[PDB]
Amino acid sequence: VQAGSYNLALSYSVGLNEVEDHIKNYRPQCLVLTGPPNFRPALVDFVGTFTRNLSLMICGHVLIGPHKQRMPELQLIANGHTKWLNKRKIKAFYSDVIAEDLRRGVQILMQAAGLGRMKPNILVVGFKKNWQSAHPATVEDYIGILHDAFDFNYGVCVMRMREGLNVEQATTIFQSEQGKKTIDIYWLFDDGGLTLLIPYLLGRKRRWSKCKIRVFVGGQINRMDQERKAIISLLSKFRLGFHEVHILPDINQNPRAEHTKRFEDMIAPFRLNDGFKDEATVNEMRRDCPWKISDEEITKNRVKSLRQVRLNEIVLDYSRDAALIVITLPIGRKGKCPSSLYMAWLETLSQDLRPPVILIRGNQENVLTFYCQ
Amino acid sequence: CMRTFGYNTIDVVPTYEHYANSTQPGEPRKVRPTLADLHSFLPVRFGWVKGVMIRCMLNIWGVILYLRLPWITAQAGIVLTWIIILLSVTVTSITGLSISAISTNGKVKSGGTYFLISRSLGPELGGSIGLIFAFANAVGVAMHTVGFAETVRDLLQEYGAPIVDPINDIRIIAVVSVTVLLAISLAGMEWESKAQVLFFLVIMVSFANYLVGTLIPPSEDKASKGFFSYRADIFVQNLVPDWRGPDGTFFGMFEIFFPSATGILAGANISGDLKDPAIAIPKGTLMAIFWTTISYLAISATIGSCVVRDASGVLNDTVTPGWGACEGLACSYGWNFTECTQQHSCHYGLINYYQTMSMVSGFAPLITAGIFGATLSSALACLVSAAKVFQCLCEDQLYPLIGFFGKGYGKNKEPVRGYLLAYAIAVAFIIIAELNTIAPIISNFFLCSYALINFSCFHASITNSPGWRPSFQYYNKWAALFGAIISVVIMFLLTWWAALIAIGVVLFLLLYVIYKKPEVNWGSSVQAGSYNLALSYSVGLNEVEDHIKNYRPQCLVLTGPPNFRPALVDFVGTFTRNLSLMICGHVLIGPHKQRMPELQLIANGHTKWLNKRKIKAFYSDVIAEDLRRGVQILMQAAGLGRMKPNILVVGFKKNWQSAHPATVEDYIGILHDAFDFNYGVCVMRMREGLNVSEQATTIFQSEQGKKTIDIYWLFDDGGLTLLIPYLLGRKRRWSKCKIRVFVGGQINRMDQERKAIISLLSKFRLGFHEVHILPDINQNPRAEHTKRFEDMIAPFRLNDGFKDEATVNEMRRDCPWKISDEEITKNRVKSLRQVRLNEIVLDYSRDAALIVITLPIGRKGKCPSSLYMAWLETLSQDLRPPVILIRGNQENVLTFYC
Ligand SMILES: Nc1ncnc2c1ncn2[C@@H]1O[C@H](COP(=O)(O)OP(=O)(O)OP(=O)(O)O)[C@@H](O)[C@H]1O
Ligand SMILES: Nc1ncnc2c1ncn2[C@@H]1O[C@H](COP(=O)(O)OP(=O)(O)OP(=O)(O)O)[C@@H](O)[C@H]1O
Numbered sequence A: 001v002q003a004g005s006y007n008l009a010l011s012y013s014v015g016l017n018e019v020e021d022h023i024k025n026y027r028p029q030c031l032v033l034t035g036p037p038n039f040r041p042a043l044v045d046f047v048g049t050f051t052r053n054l055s056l057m058i059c060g061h062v063l064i065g066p067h068k069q070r071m072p073e074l075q076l077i078a079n080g081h082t083k084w085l086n087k088r089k090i091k092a093f094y095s096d097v098i099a100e101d102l103r104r105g106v107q108i109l110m111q112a113a114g115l116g117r118m119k120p121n122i123l124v125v126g127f128k129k130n131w132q133s134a135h136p137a138t139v140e141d142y143i144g145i146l147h148d149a150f151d152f153n154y155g156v157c158v159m160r161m162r163e164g165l166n167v168e169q170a171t172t173i174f175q176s177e178q179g180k181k182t183i184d185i186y187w188l189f190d191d192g193g194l195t196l197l198i199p200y201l202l203g204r205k206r207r208w209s210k211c212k213i214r215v216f217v218g219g220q221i222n223r224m225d226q227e228r229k230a231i232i233s234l235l236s237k238f239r240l241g242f243h244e245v246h247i248l249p250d251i252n253q254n255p256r257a258e259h260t261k262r263f264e265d266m267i268a269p270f271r272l273n274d275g276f277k278d279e280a281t282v283n284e285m286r287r288d289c290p291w292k293i294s295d296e297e298i299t300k301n302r303v304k305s306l307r308q309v310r311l312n313e314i315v316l317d318y319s320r321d322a323a324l325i326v327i328t329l330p331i332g333r334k335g336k337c338p339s340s341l342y343m344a345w346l347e348t349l350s351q352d353l354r355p356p357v358i359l360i361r362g363n364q365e366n367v368l369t370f371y372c373q
Numbered sequence B: 001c002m003r004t005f006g007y008n009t010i011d012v013v014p015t016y017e018h019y020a021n022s023t024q025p026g027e028p029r030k031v032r033p034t035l036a037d038l039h040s041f042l043p044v045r046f047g048w049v050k051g052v053m054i055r056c057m058l059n060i061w062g063v064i065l066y067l068r069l070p071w072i073t074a075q076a077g078i079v080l081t082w083i084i085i086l087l088s089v090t091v092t093s094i095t096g097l098s099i100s101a102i103s104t105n106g107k108v109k110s111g112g113t114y115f116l117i118s119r120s121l122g123p124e125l126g127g128s129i130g131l132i133f134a135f136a137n138a139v140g141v142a143m144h145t146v147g148f149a150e151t152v153r154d155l156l157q158e159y160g161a162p163i164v165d166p167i168n169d170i171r172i173i174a175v176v177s178v179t180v181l182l183a184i185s186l187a188g189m190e191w192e193s194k195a196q197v198l199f200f201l202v203i204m205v206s207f208a209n210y211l212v213g214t215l216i217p218p219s220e221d222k223a224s225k226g227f228f229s230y231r232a233d234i235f236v237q238n239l240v241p242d243w244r245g246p247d248g249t250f251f252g253m254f255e256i257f258f259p260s261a262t263g264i265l266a267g268a269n270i271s272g273d274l275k276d277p278a279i280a281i282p283k284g285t286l287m288a289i290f291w292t293t294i295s296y297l298a299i300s301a302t303i304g305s306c307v308v309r310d311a312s313g314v315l316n317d318t319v320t321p322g323w324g325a326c327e328g329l330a331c332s333y334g335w336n337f338t339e340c341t342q343q344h345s346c347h348y349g350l351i352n353y354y355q356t357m358s359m360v361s362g363f364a365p366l367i368t369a370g371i372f373g374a375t376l377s378s379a380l381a382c383l384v385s386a387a388k389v390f391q392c393l394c395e396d397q398l399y400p401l402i403g404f405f406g407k408g409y410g411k412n413k414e415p416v417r418g419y420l421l422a423y424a425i426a427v428a429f430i431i432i433a434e435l436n437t438i439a440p441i442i443s444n445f446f447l448c449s450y451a452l453i454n455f456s457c458f459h460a461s462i463t464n465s466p467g468w469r470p471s472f473q474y475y476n477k478w479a480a481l482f483g484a485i486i487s488v489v490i491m492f493l494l495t496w497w498a499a500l501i502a503i504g505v506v507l508f509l510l511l512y513v514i515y516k517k518p519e520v521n522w523g524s525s526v527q528a529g530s531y532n533l534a535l536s537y538s539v540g541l542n543e544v545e546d547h548i549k550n551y552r553p554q555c556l557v558l559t560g561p562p563n564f565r566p567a568l569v570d571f572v573g574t575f576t577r578n579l580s581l582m583i584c585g586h587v588l589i590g591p592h593k594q595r596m597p598e599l600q601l602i603a604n605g606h607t608k609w610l611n612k613r614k615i616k617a618f619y620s621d622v623i624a625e626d627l628r629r630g631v632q633i634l635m636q637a638a639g640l641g642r643m644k645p646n647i648l649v650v651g652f653k654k655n656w657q658s659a660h661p662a663t664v665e666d667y668i669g670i671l672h673d674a675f676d677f678n679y680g681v682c683v684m685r686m687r688e689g690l691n692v693s694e695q696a697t698t699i700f701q702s703e704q705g706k707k708t709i710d711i712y713w714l715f716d717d718g719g720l721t722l723l724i725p726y727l728l729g730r731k732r733r734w735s736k737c738k739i740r741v742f743v744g745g746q747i748n749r750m751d752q753e754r755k756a757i758i759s760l761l762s763k764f765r766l767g768f769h770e771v772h773i774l775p776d777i778n779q780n781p782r783a784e785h786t787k788r789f790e791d792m793i794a795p796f797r798l799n800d801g802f803k804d805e806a807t808v809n810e811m812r813r814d815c816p817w818k819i820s821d822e823e824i825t826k827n828r829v830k831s832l833r834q835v836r837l838n839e840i841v842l843d844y845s846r847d848a849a850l851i852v853i854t855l856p857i858g859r860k861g862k863c864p865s866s867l868y869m870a871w872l873e874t875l876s877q878d879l880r881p882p883v884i885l886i887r888g889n890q891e892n893v894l895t896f897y898c
């Protein structure tokens, strides 16, 4: 039995080497950063909901610290984790690596995990709920994980839940049918279509097939009808079957004074308080702490920070009771956006909700097409 | 303030232009910034009514409507006739639902049915179906024009104006009509549409004429022929069947009717001339099917409710009192057909007269015009469909010569060459003038096309790729499968030999296309299905519980660029193919760490090179500062679930003497890391080296002849040292090689004299033809070779005889490769064993195809890396044949065996 299963698996995996890649056949192959899969069952459940027998799903665990690999204990624990995953009826592969820190292990997994064409192209990581009351080095490493994911051409998906992800198996929200609630999609920027593909595949399961999908797109106050018509036409060309389209004409409006003050206080303990010197003469103080923010950087990114804090209000007043909130994840340029600022943006976009909030971002490459080549 | 969202950022908002590959009406096609830009530092068109509904409706309507349907309803009755019509309609409607679903997924271009099938199912089946469809349409035009010519000949003969003879008149009339049709079609699609609309109007007028005639009271002529206007008695009597003649069977009527009304793809074959095909094809096709079905049912019922089955046709057969004995209902209206019924010799009535529908109608010439219009419309539709489908097929370039056709022309790329080819084929088949033995073949070709359409829909639905998002959601994959299966069953039930011919042609064309390996990548359910199968079986393997009963040698071959060292890949693939996983690992030193599109292109090129050598392996490339780190990454993460490597295959670095010692340090470190990861190590050495920098040849690609494979088993590693040569010896290139095992089985393991070696060899079922014992290992080697070894190791000596163990590492802090005097004196006997074993190997295995030796192991810290490399060098040196130094994982590989 095992021999025959291995033979079939190997034959088909090798045969897949001959098949060429096409946009019509694009599949989201997810590398889920779960650690021990029983610690964060919400991530596993959510990813397996839309990945089940549709695309590759890998649960990545990084064993921090130095060790001479091998040993029978590593295999025993890997077998235990695989058994736990199988008991939950989750079609996923468990993969663990040994590295000095989380960033190195994630890099190893993103570089080597997979088999031929069956290799991940999306990174799914949980939100760092405790990023403020923690050593800034950890925050820098987390943002560096995101940066490495982008550097490898991966699509990034950040999952946030109100109570966090770290906890007979545990039961999560994604094991129960959502019902008539709505999946709210905020397609603010063109990333290729990942922001839409993930919710579309999610709604193709029986647990989310009853949810009404709402798409929110930015626009102009004097061209709302035209923008709505154009976006509806685009969605119909994609044949995604999304119900409602809303246009937000006030994303550039200045946010309330209380919320901007809250955002300012959030990054207060990361202010390097040195933004009156040349960038050349400001990296000396960052040599040991490459996470502080310089007043020049804050002055340049003020508009983007305000846009983040205002998008939070827009989401709060629209998606208060949705079953899922999908927001396009903003991109911060390397070297011009300190890890603290990126973390603050991610915290500000998703807050004060009851969030199954997903921040998605494709690699700027089309994953949808209205063509049959 | 209140300006356009996105005016103050590099990121762009979603717009249609970012996804279109067409020509931008305004300026050029805008392109969204690449991820590195944001990241990183520093022509007439037709509507659905005139384009699809009219065309499909005219295609479905044929001559059976006027000349056969009344006969079928007379023979089988109204109920059985409705059953036949409904069965045909279920088949056709399932096919239409499938085509509608397949036709709403992206934007469809010119190519009609062939385009949809090929783009949804792959070039393999698509090309064969396209060729068959084009040929079938080119012959259907001839069949329809022959029907029209036969009708014209019958009319002329009835009028007494024949030209030459019944057979030749058909030839002349058909040739002239087909020429006129060709002229009409070459004038453009506007004139073709005008002609289609004219024929539709003529058919509608014919229907109105028949309906009006069926209501007026019956005249003496009509009455004496069975027509009596709607009567409850006639309707009731005409419900049960009344079979007659050699064809009076249900299957006979079904075979007459079904192939006559199935042409539902007429509208979808001009998809390149529609405005919004995704909106017009489904609606038009389904409406056409519904309306044609309604017309068939209504005609059947009305004709069966008005005409009796038998009628003499003579006006003298009126019923009067005194003479004759009336029989049947016909004698209740004052008509006596008793004599005809008794002798069964009357030529009038629903069952005996073939033109009863024309007699009933108020003007027979209108019925004749309706027949003319139906036949000509079918011929024109077939001509246009064949031309368009063939032009698309030739555009795709799946065949070696048909490429000539397909040259579009002014404005609309009209395939004039395709029109000429179709007209030539139609004329050639008309010249025969006899097609009763060819018509079943064409019908079965159309049925094959229907089955392929249905299977395309079903396969796309079952695969469920994320790109399969049809906007028409009123289909069922199970219904599509039933439609395909029933289409094949009907094809075999009608003209089974014709069905065999059609299936054989389809298979031959598919085999040709598959062998030709077309260079088209459209994205099909077949590729998505291949991915589905791979994922499903990998997950199934993962589900199976871990157990030792399925050991396989899963090799991670460090080849760098695969074309650089093809000997390594060839050797590993020899014993890995069809048995276990093989991964070709390539490490890129690289400045920093990134993966741009160029890296993906290079990886695709390497994979293509690997697949062009018929080698079953995965190419994996990683970025690392040095080779050792890349190998660590590969050994840590490479693989998927249970299909992960457990053997490391690396080449011998013959340049270690002349190179920075840090490089040899890192090489030995790679070996030690593989050992520490519970990997099996396998070092390959050749006198010419592995780096050879179409396909380069390699000694492993050739026959080995009678040369012998020599194994020097010096340590019990679990069986890999013997597993590899055994697996190698099962191939057709190593079969003639005689395997010799020089069993120094267990040096420091209490080896048995003769019993244990033979027992283990038998348990390995290796067919070891010879077993030799070489106990002359501890013997001191010749002084010359000892001096050679001393010379090779001299440069790495640290000269630390008087220095202690505690202080030796001090000067080693920056040069850990250097040897220590105490280390030299400790690894002296074990170092001379290497030279002695080299002596033995050199004297025994000098004409062997392959040499396998146990890989020495160097203990970390107390065995300097340079000394380990020296041992490896001395062990395998001066040997012409390839040398493989192996050391198993200490895990029982005997479980691999049956
Ligand atoms: N050892 C690990 N292997 C793989 N992914 C990890 C590992 N540790 C953390 N992660 C990922 O990083 C994310 C953030 O983890 P982090 O610990 O920084 O925040 P947290 O989960 O709020 O804290 P805690 O783990 O103490 O609950 C998690 O969602 C998880 O997906
Ligand atoms: N970039 C690489 N990726 C993977 N393996 C490598 C790479 N470079 C070298 N190797 C492996 O290390 C071995 C020694 O290579 P090295 O360049 O150190 O010596 P060499 O004599 O140049 O080897 P070769 O004769 O194969 O070129 C090779 O047999 C090869 O298998």
Ligand SMILES: NS(=O)(=O)c1cc2c(cc1Cl)NCNS2(=O)=O
Pocket: B059, B060, B137, B140, B141, B259, B260, B261, B262, B263, B264, B265, B266, B267, B269, B378, B381, B382, B385, B446
């Ligand atoms: N012209 S067509 O390709 O649409 C077509 C014609 C006929 C069919 C089927 C099709 Cl798809 N079957 C019945 N004989 S037909 O009218 O020539």
